[PDB]
Design a protein around this ligand. Structure first.
Ligand SMILES: Nc1ncnc2c1ncn2[C@@H]1O[C@H](COP(=O)(O)OP(=O)(O)OP(=O)(O)O)[C@@H](O)[C@H]1O
Ligand SMILES: Nc1ncnc2c1ncn2[C@@H]1O[C@H](COP(=O)(O)OP(=O)(O)OP(=O)(O)O)[C@@H](O)[C@H]1O
Ligand SMILES: Nc1ncnc2c1ncn2[C@@H]1O[C@H](COP(=O)(O)OP(=O)(O)O)[C@@H](O)[C@H]1O
Ligand SMILES: [Mg+2]
Ligand SMILES: [Mg+2]
Ligand SMILES: [Mg+2]
Lengths: 474, 470, 56, 470, 128, 128, 121
C-alpha cells in the first residue's frame, strides 16, 4: 500500500520497509512533515534521502508517498518572493498560490528544437558587453578566486534588466543567510524584485537540498522558456553543489573516482547546464540563458571541477585576484576571457569599437609588464602606453550602479577613436560622469540614432556633438 | 518470446527476473513500454541492454533511457537479439538516436527495412588485406606531412580552442564534393548546439544526402553514450560489406566513450582500477577499434578526436587509445594565435604510413626536406632570440626566409571559412601539393613577399594574389 | 669609460635576462614533476580507500 | 525502559533499547554503576546517540573512557539532548562538556533550568544586518582590518605565533570596554594552557563577567567535538534574555574538525580529500551559522585556526574561509622578528574597510598604509644586494616611513605582564587613526625607529625617545 | 610514583612511531574500521592518554614534575602526515632535525627556523 | 618440446606489458585486493614463472637451449615504474631503445648507460 | 639456512659467516599469501604483520658470547623509493648499511655507493 515504516536512519539517509508500489523519484512525506526522494528501489528496502532536519525521525515512524514525481510548483505568483528549492516561502510575506507544477528532472529540448543565438543580453558591465559578449540562450562561465566581486557582477547583471523582459532568477547555494538577506534588501532598494525570484538553501540545510537547488532553479525558468519570454538563471556557486553531491554519494557507500570526486559529477553538471539554450521559432523562440559561477584555489584553473565545467560551457570569464586586490574593479583578464557564440549577438555599432578595444587591451597588458620607465622609445611605443592607460581608466566601474547601453556604446566610441588623447590622464574618470548627464541634455539626437539604427551615430555631427561636451568638461 | 519483471532500480541499472529459465544472452535487448493503470502512474518507453548474469534467474541490465517512474513489478519483453540499427539506403541523409529512431522530424523508416546487430564478432585473420592505399583528403598539411591510409585509425589532438569540428566538416565536405566518399558521423559527448550547427553547415555546404548521422549527447544516460559509437560503426560495416565500397567513419570524442564506460562499471559494481577507470579498459576500447579495418572488399578509415584528460598522456585512457592509432595529427594553439589555419604542427604530427615506398621516394624525399627545414627553424629562432639574426651567416638566413614561406603556404582557404570570413575556398590534389612544394623548396619564387602566401590553394594562386596586391 | 660602463649595464641586463629565462624553465620542469608526484600519491590513497571498502 | 550495552570498541558503544522507546539522534544517555564484587570497577559515564541500526540497536559515542564497561550494563535514557545549565550563575565558573563545574568553587543546584545543546538556527525572517565597527583597542586590528559586530572573525596562523596571547588581550580589553558577557571555549585545549588562563583571569580580576568551558586533548573525540556547542548554548541564553552583545571566543577550531573526522572513522564511514569525513561543510556550517546579529542583539565571535604547513588549501581552513567576515593572517617570521601581535598588513582583509561602514578618513588612511608597506616589500632585495645609497630619494622616503609604520603597528600589552612584566595599555580608534596620520605626515620622522616598538600612543613614542633623550 | 613523592622526573620514549605501528597491526587483525593510511581512528586519543599525564604539580600536591621527550621518525622529510601532525598538535613545542644539515657539519643538527617552544623565555635563568 | 629434444630455440613475446594489464583486469574481475598502481603482488610470480623456463641445458640432459626475448613498453621513458623494474629483476640484461635519439635521426639508437648484459664475455666469440 | 648457521656458532663455536641472497622476497612472498589467508591491507597492500614477523627473523641473527656471526644481506627496494614499508621496517635492524643508487651507476661509477646516505655504527 501507500504506507511504510522507516527501519534505519543514517546521517541524512534512511531506509524503509513497505512502500511496495513506490516508483523511483517519487516524493515521500514522513510523519514529521519533512519529505524525501526515493532514490533506490532495491529488493525489499527503499532508500529514502531526507530533505530537511532528520533528527526527529525514529525507527518505526510512518513514511507515506505523495503520489507524484519530484516537482516544484510554479506560476506567475512567485515573482517577488524568496522560496526554498522545494518551493515553500521563507520571506515571511505569507503563502504563495501557484497552479502549475514542473518536474525537476526532464528531457531537455532536443537538437531539432534548438536554434542559433543572435540577440544580445546587455549586462551594463562595460568590459563584459564590450569584450566578452553574451546572448539569449548562451551558457557562460564566470570563474575566479574568493572575494573577487563575482556576486557584484551577478547583481549588476540582474539589475539593469528592466525594459528587456528578462524574467530573472537567483539561486543561493549553501550561502550565508546574512548575505542572502543583504542581497534581497539590495534588490528591494533598487526596485528590481518585481521581475525576479530568489531561491535559497543555506549551509544549515543538509546537503541534498543544496544538490536539488540548481535543478529547481532551472525548473522555474522553463515555464517562461515554454511560454516565450526570455529568462536568465544565476547560480551563487556550483562548486558547493559538487561538494554536496560528493557527501551524498559517499554516505550512500559509492566508491570515489579521480581526485576523490565520484565520476558521476560530469553527468550531474552537464545535465544541469545543457538545458540552457534558445528554442526555435516554431516553439516560441523562448530562452533560458545561465550564468554558472565557480571558484579556483590559488587561482589555478587547471583543477578537476574547473576543467570539467569549462568543457560544458560556451565560454569563460576569468576574474583576477591579483588585479582585484590591486583595486582594478571589476577585474577581467583579456587574454583568458573569451566566448564562442560571441561576435554574432553583439550589435553592429559595438562591433566596430569592440574589435579595436580588444586589440588595445591585448597589446597593453604585455607592454605594461615593461611600461614603468617612461622614456624608452619614441612616441610609437608610448602611444600604446597612452591608449592602454586611458583604456584601463575607462573600463573601471563604480560599485553596484549598472550602465545604460546607448551611452555605453558612445563612451567606448569616444575612447577608441582618440578624442580622449589630449585629455590629461589624471582626470580621465571624471570625464565619464560629466559626459553621461551632458549627453542626455545636449546629445539626445545621438541616443535616438543608436536606438533607431543599431549603428554608430551619423559621423558628420558626431565629432561636433562630442566636442561640445569636451569643451563643457573642465 | 517471453516476459519478465523488474525487481531492482538503482539509477540507470535495472535488475530483471526471468521465471521460466528462458534467460537472455549478454548484449541482448529488452523493452519496457507501459501506459498508466491508475492516476498515480507514469507512461514510459524504454530499451535495456543486458550486461551480466547474476544467478537465481536474475539478470543485470543498463538502461538506454532514464529510469524515472519505473515501478517494481513492471514487466519486460525479450527482443531476442542485440539492439538493431536500420541499415540500407533508407538511413542516408538523416539523423538518428542510439535506438535507430530519427531525431529529425523529416520522417521515419518503414518496417520492411532490414536491421543489423550492433554487437557482432570481429573479422578473421584470413579476411584482412596487407595492401596499403593512401586516402587522398586534399588538405595540404595532412596529405603532405602525415598521409592518412585506408583502414587506418587517425587521431586529432590539440588545445581547447583549436580547429577540430571545423576540420571534421572540412574533410567531410572535401571527400563528398570530389571523391564522392559515402561517410558516416557519430557524435559522442559533444554540445547539442553544435549538433544543430553541423546540421545547418551541411545544408549550407550542400553535402547532406550522401552522409548519415547518429547522436548521443551529454543529456543521455551513460549507457546510451557508450553504445552510440558502435551504431556508427555498424552503419559503415553495412557500406563496406554489402555495397562493397570505400567508407569513412567519424567519432567526435572517443574519451567520453571511455568515461561513460567507467561510470557504467561503477554502477554495475565492479572494483575501480588505476586512476579510477573500470577494469576492462583495453578490451572494451579494443573491440571497437579492431572492427575498423581494410578487409578484402573495402575499408572503414576513421578520423577521431582525442582529449587528454589532464594533459597527461601517461594516463590510462589516452595511452590505451594511443596504442591503436596509426596516424596522428596534432593541432596547436600557438599557431592559431596567428592567421595560420588549420593550426597543424608538422613536427608533432606523425604517420606510420609515410613509408618511403608507399608515398613514393619523391614524395618521401620532399616531405623529409620540409620537416628538416621546420625543425631547424624551431632551433634557429632560439639562436636568433639569444644571439641575434645579425649573428648568423647567409645560409642560415636563407633557411629562416624559406621557413617563413613554408609555414604560410601550409595554410589553406576553405568552405567553412565562408561563414567565418567569406573567402570562397580551394581544393588541391596530392600531386599538386607535392609539385608546388617542390618548386618552393628550390626557392626561385622567393621574390614574392611573405604577406602573399597567407591563405592559398596552389602556387599559381599565389602568383595571381601577389601581382595584383602591388 | 662611458662606453665601458654603458656596455657593462647592457651586459648585466642581458646576462640577468637570460639567467631569469633559465630559472623560469627549471621551475616549469620541477612543477611538472611535483604535480605528477602529488597526483600519484592521491591516486594511491584512493586505491587504499577502495581496498579497505571492499575488504570490510 | 532502560537500555543494555551490547558492544564496546573503544569510544564507540552499542545499546539495545527495548523497541518503542528508542532515543532520537543527538540524544543523551547516562551510565551510573557501583561494583557488586571486588573485581569490578565503579563507573559514571555519559553517551550520545549518533545513528540508528538494523533492529532495536543504537550506535553511540562515549564522553568518558570506556575502561571497565561490562556487557549487559544498564543505560539510562534522559529523553533529551545534552543539557547545559544557563543563567547568570555561570559567571566566573569553569565547566566540563556536560555542564558540571570543573573548578572546586562549588556545585550548581538541580533546581535550575538547563538548555539543550542542539537547536535549529536563526530563521530568514528573524535575522538582521546592522553594521558597527567594534573598537577592540588593538592597533593593527582597529587600523587595518576593522572588526564588526554580529559576525564571525578569524585568526589564521601556524603554531606559536601569538593566537592565545592575542585572544587574552581581546578578552581583557573587552572586559574594560563593556560589561558585555563573554564566553570562552577551550575546545581540545592543552591542560597546561587552561591553568595559565584561569589563573591570569583570576589574578587580573577579569573573571567576574565571563564564563569558561573546557574539553582537554586527553578527552575522547566526541567530547572534544561537543564542547564548542556548549559554549554556543550559553552565549545564546545571554543574547535572548538579556539582549546585549555577548562575545563567544573559540580557542582553536582545527581540533574540532579533526575530532569530527575521527568520530566518522569510528562510526565506519568512508573518508574523502585528505581523509576528512564526508560531512565536513555540514557540521561546520551548523556551528558557524548560529553566530549572528538577530533583532535582540549580537553574538560576534573571534576564532583562531591552525594552518598545518603554511598551505591554506587543506579542507579545514578552506571550508572555514567562506563563513568568516574578516580574517587576519599571523605569520611566524614577524613573531620571531619580535613585533607583536604578529599580523601581516598585506595579507589581512575585511568587509568593513569601506567609507559607508567605517568612514571616509579611515578608508584613505588604511589604503595609504597598505600601499606604503607593499612598496617596501618589493624594495628590500634591491636594498640588500645593491648599495642602499642607490635607492632614489623618494623611495628612500617610503623606506624610512615604512620602517616606522612596521614598528608602530606593535603594541605594549597587558598579557605581556606575565611574559615580560611591562604594563601595556588600551587605544581608542580616534587615537590610532590620528597617530598614523602623524606618522604619514612625516614631521616626527626625526624620532628614532627603536622607540616605536611596544607603545600605545605617539606621545608614548616621544616619552620613550625622551628616556633615550631624543 | 617518584613525582608523587616530590622528586623531579624525566621520561624518554625512544620512538613513538613504532608504538603507533604496533597499534595499527593489532587493530587491523581485530577487524576494526580503518582510516587515513590504515591507522585506526583512536590513535590521537591513545597518544593523548599517554602525553597528558606529564605535569608540574602545585605546592599543595608536592612540587614535583614529569617532563617528557617523545621522538618521531619522519620518512624522507615527510610532514603533514597523520602521526607527525597528531603529535605536533599535542606537544607544547617541537624540535626538527635536518639530515642535510647533519651532512653539512652542523651537530647536533637543529633548525632554529622550524623549531618552537611555547614555554620558552620563562624556563631560562635570568642571565640566559 | 624442441629444447628437451636437443635443438636450439628462440622465443619473442611481442609485448609482456599487455600480459600484466590482462592479469590486472582478470584479478580485479575476481575480488583480489590491489597493490602498487592497482597491480597485485602476484605480478612478480607470474613473470618469474614465465621467464626461468628459458635455459641452457647440460650434456647429461641433452644440450638444448631456449633463449627468450621479452618486450616491455615504457610510458614516457619511466624505467623507474613498477612493471619495468619487476621484469628487469628477472631478466639477464636489458636493451633500452631511446626516442630522443631516434627522432633526432639516429635510427636506431641504444642508450649505453641504461643497457647492460650480465652474460657478457661468456657469450661472445674470443675476437670480440 | 639460518638454522644451520645457528648450530655451527653454538655447538662448534667457530665464527660463522652467513649470506642471504635477497631477503626482500621473504616479505613479498608474505604479501602474496597474506591476502588469500584473509587479513586486510596496510599502507601499500602489505600484510598487517610486516614488522613483527620480519623482526622475528632478523632478531635471531645475533652474535652471542658463545660465538660470533657476521651476516651480509641484500634488500631490493621495491622501486627506487625507500619510503616503502618493507625497506622502512628493515633499516633499523642493520649495524652497517650500504645504499646503492641508480643515478650514480648510470654515470658509470661502480660500485654505485651513495656517499651521503651510507651509515655504520
Ligand atoms: N566596482 C567596485 N567598486 C568597489 N568595490 C567593488 C567593486 N566591485 C566589487 N567590489 C567589492 O568586491 C567585494 C567582493 O565581494 P562579493 O560580494 O563579490 O563576495 P565574493 O567576491 O563572491 O566572495 P564570497 O563568494 O567568498 O562571498 C565586495 O565587497 C564588493 O564590495
Ligand atoms: N579553418 C578555419 N578558418 C577560420 N577560423 C577557424 C578555422 N579553424 C578554426 N577557426 C577558429 O577557431 C574556432 C574553432 O571552432 P570549432 O567549432 O572547431 O571548436 P572545437 O575546437 O571543435 O570545440 P570543441 O573542441 O569543444 O568541440 C572557430 O570558431 C574559429 O574562430
Ligand atoms: N608580547 C609578548 N611578549 C613576550 N613574549 C611573547 C609575547 N607574545 C607572545 N610571546 C611568546 O610567544 C608565545 C606564543 O605562544 P602561543 O601563541 O600562546 O601558543 P598557543 O597559541 O599554541 O597557545 C608565548 O607563549 C610567549 O612565549
Ligand atoms: Mg560571492
Ligand atoms: Mg565542436
Ligand atoms: Mg593554543
Amino acid at each position: 500500500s501507500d504506507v511504510g515504516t522507516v527501519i534505519q536512519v543514517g546521517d541524512g539517509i534512511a531506509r524503509a520497509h513497505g512502500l511496495d508500489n513506490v516508483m523511483s523519484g517519487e516524493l515521500v512525506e514522513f510523519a514529521n512533515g519533512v519529505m524525501g526522494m526515493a532514490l533506490n528501489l532495491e529488493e525489499n528496502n527503499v532508500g529514502i534521502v531526507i530533505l530537511g532536519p532528520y533528527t526527529g525521525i525514529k525507527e518505526g515512524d510512518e513514511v507515506r508517498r505523495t503520489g507524484r514525481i519530484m516537482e516544484v510548483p510554479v506560476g506567475e505568483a512567485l515573482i517577488g518572493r524568496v522560496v526554498n528549492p522545494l518551493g515553500q516561502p521563507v520571506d515571511g510575506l505569507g503563502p504563495v498560490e501557484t497552479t502549475e507544477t514542473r518536474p525537476i528532472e526532464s528531457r531537455a529540448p532536443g537538437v531539432m528544437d534548438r536554434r542559433s543565438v543572435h540577440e544580445p543580453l546587455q549586462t551594463g558591465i562595460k568590459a563584459i558587453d564590450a569584450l566578452v559578449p553574451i546572448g539569449r540562450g548562451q551558457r557562460e562561465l564566470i570563474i575566479g578566486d574568493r572575494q573577487t566581486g563575482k556576486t557584484s557582477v551577478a547583481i549588476d547583471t540582474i539589475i539593469n534588466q528592466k525594459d528587456q523582459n528578462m524574467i530573472s532568477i537567483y539561486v543561493a547555494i549553501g550561502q550565508k543567510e546574512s548575505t542572502v538577506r543583504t542581497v534581497v534588501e539590495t534588490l528591494r532598494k533598487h526596485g528590481a524584485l518585481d521581475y525576479t525570484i530568489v531561491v535559497t538553501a543555506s549551509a544549515s540545510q543538509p546537503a541534498p537540498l543544496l544538490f536539488l537547488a540548481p535543478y529547481a532553479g532551472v525548473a522555474m525558468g522553463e515555464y517562461f522558456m515554454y511560454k516565450g519570454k526570455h529568462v536568465l538563471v544565476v547560480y551563487d556557486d556550483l562548486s558547493k553543489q559538487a561538494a554536496a553531491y560528493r557527501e551524498l554519494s559517499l554516505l550512500l557507500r559509492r566508491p570515489p573516482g579521480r581526485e576523490a570526486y565520484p565520476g558521476d559529477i560530469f553527468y550531474l553538471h552537464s545535465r544541469l547546464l545543457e538545458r540552457a539554450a534558445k528554442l526555435s521559432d516554431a516553439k516560441g523562440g523562448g530562452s533560458l540563458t545561465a550564468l554558472p559561477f565557480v571558484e579556483t584555489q590559488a587561482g589555478d584553473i587547471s583543477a578537476y571541477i574547473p576543467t570539467n565545467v569549462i568543457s560544458i560551457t560556451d565560454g569563460q570569464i576569468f576574474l583576477q585576484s591579483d588585479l582585484f586586490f590591486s583595486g582594478v574593479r571589476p577585474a577581467i583578464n583579456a587574454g583568458l576571457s573569451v566566448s564562442r557564440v560571441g561576435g554574432a549577438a553583439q550589435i553592429k555599432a559595438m562591433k566596430k569599437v569592440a574589435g579595436t578595444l580588444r586589440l588595445d587591451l591585448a597589446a597593453y597588458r604585455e607592454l605594461e609588464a615593461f611600461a614603468q620607465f617612461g622614456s624608452d622609445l619614441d612616441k610609437a611605443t608610448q602611444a600604446k602606453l597612452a591608449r592602454g592607460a586611458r583604456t584601463v581608466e575607462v573600463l573601471k566601474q563604480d560599485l553596484h550602479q549598472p550602465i545604460p547601453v546607448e551611452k555605453q556604446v558612445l563612451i567606448i566610441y569616444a575612447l577608441t577613436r582618440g578624442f580622449l588623447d589630449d585629455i590629461p590622464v589624471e582626470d580621465v574618470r571624471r570625464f565619464e560622469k560629466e559626459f553621461y548627464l551632458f549627453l542626455d541634455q545636449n546629445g539626445q539626437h545621438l541616443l535616438e540614432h543608436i536606438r533607431t539604427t543599431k549603428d554608430l551615430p551619423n559621423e558628420d555631427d558626431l565629432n561636433k556633438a562630442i566636442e561640445a561636451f569636451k569643451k563643457t568638461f573642465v | 518470446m517471453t516476459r519478465g519483471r523488474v525487481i531492482q532500480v538503482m539509477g540507470p541499472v535495472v535488475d530483471v527476473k526471468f521465471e521460466n529459465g528462458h534467460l537472455p544472452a549478454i548484449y541482448n535487448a529488452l523493452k519496457i513500454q507501459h501506459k498508466a493503470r491508475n492516476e498515480n502512474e507514469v507512461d514510459i518507453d524504454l530499451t535495456l541492454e543486458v550486461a551480466l548474469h547474476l544467478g537465481d534467474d536474475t539478470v543485470r541490465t543498463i538502461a538506454m533511457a532514464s529510469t524515472d517512474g519505473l515501478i517494481r513489478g513492471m514487466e519486460v519483453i525479450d527482443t531476442g537479439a542485440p539492439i538493431s540499427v536500420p541499415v540500407g539506403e533508407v538511413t542516408l541523409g538523416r539523423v538518428f538516436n542510439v535506438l535507430g529512431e530519427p531525431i529529425d522530424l523529416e520522417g521515419d523508416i518503414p518496417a520492411d527495412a532490414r536491421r543489423d546487430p550492433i554487437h557482432r564478432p570481429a573479422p578473421k585473420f584470413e579476411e584482412l588485406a596487407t595492401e596499403v592505399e593512401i586516402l587522398e583528403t586534399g588538405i595540404k598539411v595532412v596529405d603532405l606531412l602525415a598521409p592518412y591510409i585506408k583502414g587506418g585509425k587517425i587521431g586529432l589532438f590539440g588545445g581547447a580552442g583549436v580547429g577540430k569540428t571545423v576540420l571534421i566538416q572540412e574533410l567531410i565536405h572535401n571527400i563528398a564534393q570530389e571523391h564522392g566518399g559515402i561517410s558516416v558521423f557519430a557524435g559522442v559527448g559533444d554540445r547539442t548546439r553544435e549538433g544543430n550547427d553541423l546540421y545547418h553547415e551541411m545544408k549550407d555546404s550542400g553535402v547532406i544526402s550522401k552522409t548519415a548521422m547518429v547522436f548521443g549527447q551529454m543529456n543521455e544516460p551513460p549507457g546510451a553514450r557508450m553504445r552510440v559509437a558502435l551504431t556508427g560503426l555498424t552503419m559503415a560495416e553495412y557500406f563496406r560489406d554489402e555495397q562493397g565500397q570505400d567508407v569513412l567513419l567519424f567519432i567526435d570524442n572517443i574519451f567520453r566513450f571511455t568515461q561513460a564506460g567507467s561510470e557504467v562499471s561503477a554502477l554495475l559494481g565492479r572494483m575501480p582500477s588505476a586512476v579510477g577507470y573500470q577494469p576492462t579498459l583495453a578490451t572494451e576500447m579494443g573491440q571497437l577499434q579492431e572492427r575498423i579495418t581494410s578487409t578484402a572488399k573495402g575499408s572503414i578509415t576513421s578520423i577521431q578526436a582525442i582529449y587528454v584528460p589532464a594533459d597527461d598522456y601517461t594516463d590510462p585512457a589516452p595511452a590505451t587509445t594511443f596504442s591503436h592509432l596509426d596516424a596522428t595529427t596534432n593541432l596547436e594553439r600557438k599557431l592559431a594565435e596567428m592567421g595560420i589555419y588549420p593550426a597543424v604542427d608538422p613536427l608533432a604530427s606523425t604517420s606510420r604510413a609515410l613509408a618511403p615506398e608507399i608515398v613514393g621516394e619523391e614524395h618521401y624525399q620532399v616531405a623529409r626536406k620540409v620537416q628538416q627545414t621546420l625543425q631547424r627553424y624551431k632551433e634557429l629562432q632560439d639562436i636568433i632570440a639569444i644571439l641575434g639574426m645579425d649573428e648568423l651567416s647567409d645560409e642560415d638566413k636563407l633557411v629562416v626566409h624559406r621557413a617563413r614561406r613554408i609555414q604560410f603556404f601550409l595554410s589553406q582557404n576553405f568552405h567553412v571559412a565562408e561563414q567565418f570570413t567569406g573567402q570562397p575556398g580551394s581544393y588541391v590534389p596530392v600531386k599538386e601539393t607535392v609539385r608546388g612544394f617542390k618548386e618552393i623548396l628550390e626557392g626561385k619564387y622567393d621574390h614574392l613577399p611573405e604577406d602573399a602566401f597567407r591563405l592559398v590553394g596552389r602556387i599559381e594562386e599565389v602568383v595571381e594574389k601577389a601581382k595584383a596586391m602591388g | 669609460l662611458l662606453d665601458a660602463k654603458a656596455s657593462e649595464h647592457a651586459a648585466r641586463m642581458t646576462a640577468m635576462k637570460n639567467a631569469t629565462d633559465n630559472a623560469n624553465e627549471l621551475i616549469r620542469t620541477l612543477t611538472l614533476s611535483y604535480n605528477r608526484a602529488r597526483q600519484a600519491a592521491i591516486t594511491q590513497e584512493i586505491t587504499e580507500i577502495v581496498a579497505g571498502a571492499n575488504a570490510l
